[PDB]
Amino acid sequence: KITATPSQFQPALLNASKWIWTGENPIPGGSNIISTRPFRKNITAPCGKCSVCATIVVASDDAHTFYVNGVRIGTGAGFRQGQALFVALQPTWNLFAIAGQNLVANSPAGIMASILVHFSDGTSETFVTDESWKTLRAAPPENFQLPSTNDSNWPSAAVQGAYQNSVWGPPVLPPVLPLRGSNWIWTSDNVNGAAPVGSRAFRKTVNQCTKVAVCATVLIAADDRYTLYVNGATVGSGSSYTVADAYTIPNLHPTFNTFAINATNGGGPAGVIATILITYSDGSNETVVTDASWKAIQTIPQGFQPPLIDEFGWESAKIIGAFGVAPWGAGMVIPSA
Ligand SMILES: *[C@@H]1O[C@H](CO)[C@@H](O[C@@H]2O[C@H](CO)[C@@H](O)[C@H](O)[C@H]2NC(C)=O)[C@H](O)[C@H]1NC(C)=O
Ligand SMILES: *[C@@H]1O[C@H](CO)[C@@H](O[C@H]2O[C@H](CO)[C@@H](O)[C@H](O)[C@H]2NC(C)=O)[C@H](O)[C@H]1NC(C)=O
Ligand SMILES: *[C@@H]1O[C@H](CO)[C@@H](O[C@H]2O[C@H](CO)[C@@H](O)[C@H](O)[C@H]2NC(C)=O)[C@H](O)[C@H]1NC(C)=O
Ligand SMILES: OC[C@H]1O[C@H](O)[C@H](O)[C@@H](O)[C@H]1O
Ligand SMILES: [Ca+2]
Ligand SMILES: [Ca+2]
């Protein structure tokens, strides 16, 4: 049962996390052979909280594949910057599994991750890679990542370093979500690089009736100002086109969700841009961006935000341009993952 409500996005941090490998070289940050190595950790929910979903940040020397409860949720590489991943969880326990690869002979090897678990009651806790994870001094067995594998006589992982103290130094957090891939949109009264003074509304519905939606993460900015609504409830608002806002919606409807925006132009150019990531209970996700599949209207009707209004006399939203275009450029400050 979920009492958590929409909130400012809380970044997962690598500060308490550790670099792990097998200990085949007993020198942490020491030279290791070209190899692939498994890592597993069963994490159980405290008390009587349920776990709902997780924000994940993961970094690797040299590369990684990340699994949750047997499902591949991502592939990545590199220790200078982490990769953001989002996933729905089982309510009481979750098996995290990583395949790490060292790709350069005589080079250091290591995996670092932070798993920020969001609970049914609106609390969070960070879990990290450390000595309590299990590994093998061999290539991963077939199905090493499924819960059905017994990791009981696997050895402990060996710590290679901490966030501040390691051969790698501290990885930079990635952006929570990319704006690359999204579009500044407006009503079709936005011509010759300016739009009238006034408020305009935008709507997007996601409805996969054969899947169970769990959590959404939203990244949004507007020239001049916006208010954002999910299923008619206020999520938040901002007034900056140079600093974006990120939100978590932990209480999604399982099949049908409507995002609505009242955005206001104070004068000159105008636009609204957003990236939305939705997690599904099978471990899959969907990305939605501001584009021409959104609906827009120039006079905002009463109830523009309720989920099931009549969209007659809403137009396709106009693409002003892909993220990057003048006048706003590529420099938006995006919260960390
Ligand atoms: C959302 O899910 C999919 C798979 O369930 C992930 O990715 C595709 O998977 C890889 C892994 O990063 C990407 O490189 C590709 O771009 C996708 N396939 C292509 C282009 O063929 C993705 O990681 C997940 N997102 C999360 C967990 O945040
Ligand atoms: C992860 O740990 C959990 C909790 O310790 C394991 O869960 C269970 O295992 C018991 C013995 O099989 C069951 O009879 C319990 O009902 C159940 N406990 C809870 C709290 O759910 C779980 O199997 C582990 N998963 C993996 C992949 O090891
Ligand atoms: C859309 O947003 C704008 C601004 O966020 C809303 O505007 C105004 O309406 C108030 C009436 O409640 C007035 O007191 C203010 O003069 C004015 N406020 C601002 C900050 O402009 C607008 O009503 C919003 N809603 C709709 C449905 O248009
Ligand atoms: O980036 C263009 C910028 O310039 C204008 O004159 C306005 O004050 C802002 O609302 C913004 O639209
Ligand atoms: Ca290496
Ligand atoms: Ca403006």
Supply the DSSP string of 130-153, one letter for each residue: STTSEE-SSSPPTTTTSTTS--TT
Tokens in use for 165? 């103290």
Distance CA 121, CA 127 (A): 18
Distance CA 148, CA 58 (A): 24
Q: Which residues contact 223 (CB under 8 A, 6 or more apart)?
A: 184, 241, 265, 269, 270, 271, 272, 328
Q: Is there an atom of ligand 2 within 6 Å of 93 CB?
A: yes
CB 193 within 8 A of CB 271: no
Residue 84 CA, ligand 5 centroid: distance in Å: 21
Tokens in use for 242? 């140079």
Listed residue (224, 278, 223, 269) closest to 247, CA to CA: 278
Neighbours of 287 (CB within 10 A): 12
Judged on CB neighbours under 10 Å (0-12, 13-18, 19+), 38 is: buried
Neighbours of 9 (CB within 10 A): 18
Q: Using CA positions, which residue lies closest to atom 25 of ligand 3? A: 262
Listed residue (67, 51, 177) closest to 113, CA to CA: 67
Distance from the Cα of residue 267 to its chain's centroid: 33
Resolution in A: 2.4
Residue 199 CA, ligand 3 centroid: distance in Å: 8
Listed residue (135, 146, 128) closest to 58, CA to CA: 128
Q: Using CA positions, which residue lies closest to atom 26 of ligand 2? A: 147
Listed residue (177, 261, 185, 187) closest to 219, CA to CA: 177
Distance CA 26, CA 159 (A): 10
Judged on CB neighbours under 10 Å (0-12, 13-18, 19+), 198 is: middle
Instruction: Kindly report the backbone phi and psi dihedral angles of residue 307, in degrees, each rounded to the nearest multiple of 5, phi listed first.
Output: -55, -35
Distance CA 266, CA 28 (A): 57
Closest ligand 1 atom, CA of 285?
A: 1
CB 126 within 8 A of CB 114: yes
Neighbours of 193 (CB within 10 A): 12
| Per-residue DSSP letter, 232 | T
CB 218 within 8 A of CB 279: no
**Total residues belonging to the chain:** 337
Closest ligand 2 atom, CA of 148?
A: 27
SS3 assignment, position 270? coil
Looking at the CA of 95, name the nearest ligand: 2
Distance CA 107, CA 121 (A): 44
Q: Is there an atom of ligand 3 within 6 Å of 265 CB?
A: no
Distance from the Cα of residue 317 to its chain's centroid: 25
Distance CA 166, CA 184 (A): 41
Looking at the CA of 84, name the nearest ligand: 1
Q: Is there an atom of ligand 1 within 6 Å of 85 CB?
A: yes
Q: How crowded is the C-beta side of 19, counted as CA atoms within 13 Å?
A: 28
Q: Write the CA distances from 119 to 42, 90, 113, integer angstroms.
A: 17, 11, 19
Residue 269 CA, ligand 4 centroid: distance in Å: 6
